[PDB]
Write a structure and sequence with these properties.
This is part of a larger assembly, with one chain. The protein is built from one helix and no strands. It has about 50 residues and is an all-alpha fold. The relative contact order is 0.19. This is DNA-directed RNA polymerase subunit beta'. DNA-dependent RNA polymerase catalyzes the transcription of DNA into RNA using the four ribonucleoside triphosphates as substrates. It comes from Mycobacterium tuberculosis (strain ATCC 25618 / H37Rv). The RNAP catalytic core consists of 2 alpha, 1 beta, 1 beta' and 1 omega subunit. When a sigma factor is associated with the core the holoenzyme is formed, which can initiate transcription.
Length: about 50
Amino acid sequence: GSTEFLPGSLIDRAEFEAENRRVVAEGGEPAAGRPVLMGITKASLATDS
């Protein structure tokens, strides 16, 4: 919608819910998201550092 996200990426639950609460509070749009399961190499190679 209007949440500045690319449909198909992998984002953390905390950031996802924070953005979903921020957007609805001003303009109003809930983004969609389903839980996913990853490996131990794709979770380690996709960190924030």
